Design a protein around this ligand. Structure first.
Ligand SMILES: CCC[C@H](N)C(=O)N[C@@H]1[C@H](O)[C@@H](CO)O[C@H]1n1cnc2c(N)ncnc21
Ligand SMILES: CCC[C@H](N)C(=O)N[C@@H]1[C@H](O)[C@@H](CO)O[C@H]1n1cnc2c(N)ncnc21
Ligand SMILES: [K+]
Lengths: 279, 284
């Protein structure tokens, strides 16, 4: 059965020149599926697969919100032609085609009678979005950048992911690879100013405030591509932090993750910074 | 743009035996797309393609009676459908998807099979049947005075159009007249599909057309030298003359709007069929 994600919306702060005519002064969001909305205080950057192909998809300005935990289905919405969508759709999401169809079949983006089709304004490689500044929710850094991550799967989520390197071993590893490998930075023209240090957001009694760093050392993870080791560190950190982790930032500071998580998810959804996304 | 049909509901009077367990506890309808709801007073039979494959499709009991978008519920599981759906429609799979995408039949959460795990909604099909196996099914059809009409074979049906199942008003459709005549004049065709004489009902006088009278379809078939339901070029012309002529000059002589011009009564008849639950608005 489907997994419930929180779809995090990250607004593009400066549209790249080459996308200007295509987005026609609509708001553009990069969207990222996460199981851990409580960690959004720690965002340092955003991650994209360089060779991955993403769509710029037309989306609803408003989505009908629902109690997914006490309901028997979900609604979608189909139009005759593109021009009919324009009253309700002035928002663009960057995401994989795969995920855009999943979104269409739960009322996040429109379908049209084109077998029904999404409204794709164009395609882009992730490489072409590297260095794009994004306005991000909750993180006190506020403005963060898109960086390359090579371990991403285009078959999961949107193909674009948040980075919380304090409390995700994958994120820690990927960031450390960027910080320690000049040739990688040279290859993708990564500017020094795009790289932000981890933030102390979660206290784990025993481990302190950089649990992901300690777990990377405990499993001797050397790169973002040590998948076997990273898979284990990821599952341990999730269990370790869901029970023992105390938030030390934001409205629910001093609470445990298990107690605050749902409240944070609600808040994100009511403020418009995130959506419920099932795939 | 898409054209606005009226989807007519023909209630199955007695379910064919082989489908009885499948549709137990549910009202079953054959559904037919028509541009001519005003002619349902003259229904003599129903038409199906023998080789065609039709689905038994679970349907909403209630539907939402511009150029906005149209909502659609995708249900988590088959089971959830059950409470707002005790209705089955017989129709082509193609037409059922069209119906699903305008809120007429439920969709259910599904996935692309084998390689992919991507969300792909499905109609709730209860079974696939050939048209041949429904020949002779008795139907309770709206507006016609015939208490029962029957499903008969027609060979000129296109499976891409409407539901693949069509109404028969042989007094005012040249196609219907020609197909019915083929059955009435070919014993070997009746033997081939085991057609009983009591399934073959006569045209009903329903519309008076200046210069033609009450059997305009027969007179057009004579005029265009139509001898067979397969005379597609002649039939298409005849159909194009009869549509305009009847809309603006044809006078209804049956129903509540007897005495009125078709152009003045058609929408009122269509509203009434919809309110009474005998039909739905169907775009394709
Ligand atoms: C802990 C906060 C920061 C962290 N980065 C996070 O939220 N990761 C996503 C999520 O928490 C996890 C679920 O398995 O996988 C990640 N994920 C989602 N989509 C993908 C994808 N397409 N490819 C690889 N990983 C993914
Ligand atoms: C005058 C009433 C009786 C008349 N018989 C009627 O209602 N015909 C349908 C409709 O009015 C017409 C639209 O062109 O095609 C017919 N039609 C609908 N579906 C199909 C199909 N699948 N194949 C061939 N014709 C079709
Ligand atoms: K009747």
């Amino acid at each position: 059965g489907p997994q419930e994600y929180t779809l995090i919306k990250l607004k593009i702060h400066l549209i790249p020149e080459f996308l200007g005519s295509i987005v026609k002064g609509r708001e553009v969001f990069v969207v990222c599926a996460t199981l851990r909305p409580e960690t959004m205080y720690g965002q340092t950057n955003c991650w994209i697969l360089p060779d991955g192909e993403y769509d710029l998809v037309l989306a609803f300005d408003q989505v009908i919100p629902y109690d997914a935990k006490t309901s028997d289905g979900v609604l979608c919405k189909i139009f005759d032609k593109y021009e009919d969508t324009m009253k309700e759709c002035n928002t663009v999401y960057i995401c994989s085609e795969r995920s855009a169809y999943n979104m269409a079949y739960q009322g996040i983006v429109p379908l049209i009678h084109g077998l029904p089709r999404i409204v794709s304004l164009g395609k882009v490689y992730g490489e072409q979005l590297i260095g794009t500044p994004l306005s991000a929710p909750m993180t006190p850094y506020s403005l963060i950048f898109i960086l390359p991550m090579f371990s991403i799967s285009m078959e999961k989520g949107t193909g674009i992911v948040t980075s919380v390197p304090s409390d995700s071993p994958d994120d820690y590893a990927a960031l450390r690879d960027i910080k320690t490998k000049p040739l990688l930075r040279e290859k993708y023209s990564i500017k020094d100013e795009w790289i932000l240090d981890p933030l102390e957001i979660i206290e784990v009694p025993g481990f302190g405030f950089m649990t992901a760093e300690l777990l990377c050392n405990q499993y001797k993870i050397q790169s973002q591509n040590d998948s076997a080791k990273l898979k284990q560190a990821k599952e341990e950190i999730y269990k370790k932090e869901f029970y023992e982790g105390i938030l030390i930032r934001g409205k629910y500071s001093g609470m445990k993750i298990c107690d605050a998580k749902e409240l944070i998810r609600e808040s994100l959804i009511k403020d418009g910074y995130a959506l419920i996304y099932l795939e």
